């Protein structure tokens, strides 16, 4: 399930730090240690950590096939191998510069690339852990125009016959508050196929709740995944943590 | 093993619909075995016991059915193992060489349970059937009942993972932590509350099994 993993979302846009520092110092604080993060959605991943080495494992992702390059990124010392698998996405189509990275604790037996219907939108790149899927997105900064189409394409793709059993969870910088995204998915989306997950307080020094995630309702125990906001990091907007509601 | 079992109070539909979810994110295994991260202590365990022996499920149910406060029913949820179902012995043997320590009370417990901890949440795709365990008070037996078999049970050709639980955090050199256990010295991680029950709709009242320390009851039955 989704609550099964400590899923988190974050964007590297900082406007005041280095392009690769937050990868080494900030993201590590979220991932290192079992009390860290399981799956971290890193938007604006201009480049993966230099300390990571590509694994060369070819990927034939579902949906739209774009080059997805997986890296091995040790986090701990050379003795205790805290191996992390960074699923990056840089160059796909004329709408180049995806810069979406999904670093996870375990390697993903499947990777999904769900290009929304819009032409200038970013492809929804996600990983697959057994019967669990964790997608991320990065809508346009002009008000999340494809934000709706970003979540819809994900739904449409995971209502397929073979992709139905999966419990997917899209989370990224939608650039559109939940009340605005939930507005684009209400006129006809009347089954509540997805339950938007966003924190209470804003998620940007100047913005609102642009950073959040969305979990399919029909997926098991989707109601447990509560979207909390990680304390301020070096980026421009907070990282959104998707933990499980206590029991 | 091939099919691990778990006793729960949620009706079969609830599990076949939602399945079994973890209690939290705490990956500290030394805490799980001792029941500290399960319904006993912090209640944030990132595993699910899922004993392999059907006898343990009867013991689990007998532990519950044999209380003057438990009213609801209890059916066994036969759960198919997969690449994410991990036993203890491979996980303990690794946590030992890594500097950890599992005092003989934990080893004593772990040997009786035959646990197969599910690092991931047990999805309905794995739960095969739910055997509604009936209890004859006059005899104290735990007999089977209507075995409502799951509908969407994906009968994959998978078995338990004999490897080591991945992402096991650094262990504690010496814990002396209260080993919570209920009924006939069953690990606390088998209780109904050992898995989150935040299911859609009004959460049916789950029994709050009062656990006990397994360390003494163990040390009492060994010596003398």
């Amino acid at each position: 399930n989704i609550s099964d993993y400590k899923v988190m979302t974050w964007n590297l846009q900082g406007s005041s730090a280095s392009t690769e520092s937050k990868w080494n110092v900030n993201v590590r604080q979220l991932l290192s240690g079992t009390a860290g993060v399981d799956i971290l959605m890193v938007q604006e991943a201009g480049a993966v950590p230099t300390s990571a080495v590509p694994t060369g494992r070819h990927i034939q992702p579902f949906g739209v096939g774009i080059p997805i390059d997986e890296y091995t990124w040790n986090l701990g010392t050379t003795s205790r191998q805290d191996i992390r698998y960074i699923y990056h996405s840089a160059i796909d189509v004329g709408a180049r510069r995806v810069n979406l990275a999904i670093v996870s604790r375990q390697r993903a037996d499947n990777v999904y690339v769900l290009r929304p219907t819009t032409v200038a939108s970013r492809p929804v790149i996600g990983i697959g852990l057994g019967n669990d899927v964790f997608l991320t997105a990065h809508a346009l900064a002009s008000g999340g125009p494809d934000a709706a189409a970003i979540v819809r394409v994900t739904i449409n793709f995971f209502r397929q016959p073979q992709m139905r059993h999966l419990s997917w969870f899209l989370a990224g910088d939608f650039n559109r508050s939940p009340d605005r995204l939930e507005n684009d998915l209400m006129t006809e989306h009347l089954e509540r196929v997805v339950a938007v997950l966003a924190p209470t307080e804003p998620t940007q020094i100047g913005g609102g709740i642009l950073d959040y995630g969305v979990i399919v309702d029909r997926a098991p125990y989707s109601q447990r995944v509560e979207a909390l906001r990680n304390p301020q990091l070096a980026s421009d907007h907070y990282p959104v943590a998707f933990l499980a509601r206590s029991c | 093993v091939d099919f691990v079992y778990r006793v729960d109070s949620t009706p079969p539909d609830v599990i076949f619909r939602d399945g079994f979810s973890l209690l939290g994110y705490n990956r500290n295994f030394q805490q799980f075995i001792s029941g500290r991260s399960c319904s006993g202590g912090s209640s944030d365990s990132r595993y699910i016991a899922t004993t392999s022996s059907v006898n343990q499920t009867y013991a689990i149910a007998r532990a519950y059915y044999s209380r003057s406060t438990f009213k609801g029913n209890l059916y066994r949820y036969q759960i198919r193992a997969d690449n994410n179902f991990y036993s203890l012995l491979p996980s303990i043997t690794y946590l030992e060489t890594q500097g950890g320590h599992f005092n003989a009370y934990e080893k004593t417990m772990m040997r009786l349970q035959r646990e197969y901890v599910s690092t991931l949440s047990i999805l309905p795709e794995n739960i095969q059937k739910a055997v509604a365990l009936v209890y004859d008070s006059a005899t104290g037996l735990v007999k089977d009942g209507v075995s409502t078999m799951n509908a969407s049970y994906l009968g994959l050709s998978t078995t338990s993972n004999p490897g080591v639980i991945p992402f096991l955090p650094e262990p504690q050199t010496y814990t002396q932590q209260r080993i919570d256990a209920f009924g006939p010295l069953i690990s606390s991680c088998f209780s109904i509350g050992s898995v989150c029950h935040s299911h859609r709709g009004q959460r049916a009242d789950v029994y709050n099994m009062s656990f006990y320390d397994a360390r003494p009851v163990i040390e009492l039955i060994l010596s003398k």
């Epitope: 449409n156 209502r159 016959p161 009347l190 089954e191 029909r218 | 619909r17």
Partner: antibody
């Protein structure tokens, strides 16, 4: 408002190829799956196929293949249903409806395109 | 193709009657079904989608229920406008199929 302006009724020759346009107006046509349902003058509904306008993906009912080839044009937001071998049994009203999500109900339908052979 | 059927082809029910129309499927389509209302001349109007989600902006008198291979569209207080054909259509598999059509009556 979201509506599906269908084409007018069409009477066909014995077994020609007929086209049933479905003008999708009021929403992002390139975002949803356009379906196609035929209902005899007194019988129930029978969904023919679907068309994903963004990628042109198509899924038929495995029995209208030889008598229906779905196709759309992102420009003008119209879905064309080229039906072949318009036998007397094909005399019915063909509805087009936008599917909200892949494998989901069809929120908005068309007024109908009564096709008849003679 | 997972066909579907409606045991009641003409659910004769007068005004204000609790008109529940059955629907049986050939495979588990839990929470995945659509109920379309179709007047004699009008086009099929989606009433319920999924398990029981009533279409936004529709009368609350309607009500869906069921899962697996059985379903039931409950109509508490019938109405002349509501006296029309109804079709239960699964979308769990790519070959879609509609109910037999329970054309209402009085």
């Amino acid at each position: 408002e979201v509506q599906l302006q269908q084409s007018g009724p069409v009477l066909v020759k014995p077994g020609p190829s007929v086209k049933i346009s479905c003008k999708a107006s009021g929403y992002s046509f390139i975002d949803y799956f356009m379906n196609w349902v035929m209902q005899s003058h007194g019988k129930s509904l029978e969904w023919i196929g679907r068309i994903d306008p963004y990628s042109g993906d198509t899924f038929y009912n495995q029995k209208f293949k030889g008598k229906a080839t779905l196709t759309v044009d992102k420009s003008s937001t119209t879905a064309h249903m080229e039906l072949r071998s318009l036998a007397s049994e094909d005399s019915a009203v063909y509805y087009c409806a936008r599917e909200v999500l892949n494998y989901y109900a069809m929120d908005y339908w068309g007024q109908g395109t009564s096709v008849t052979v003679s | 193709d997972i066909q579907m059927t409606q045991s009641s082809s003409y659910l004769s029910v007068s005004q204000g009657d609790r008109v529940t129309i059955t629907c049986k499927a050939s495979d588990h389509i839990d929470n995945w079904l659509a109920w379309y209302q179709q007047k004699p001349g009008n086009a099929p109007r989606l009433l319920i989608s999924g398990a029981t989600s009533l279409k936004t902006g529709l009368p609350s008198r309607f009500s869906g229920s069921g899962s697996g291979k059985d379903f039931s569209l409950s109509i508490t207080n019938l109405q002349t406008e509501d006296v029309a054909s109804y079709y239960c259509q699964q979308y769990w598999r790519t070959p879609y199929t509609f109910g037999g059509g329970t054309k209402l009556e009085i």
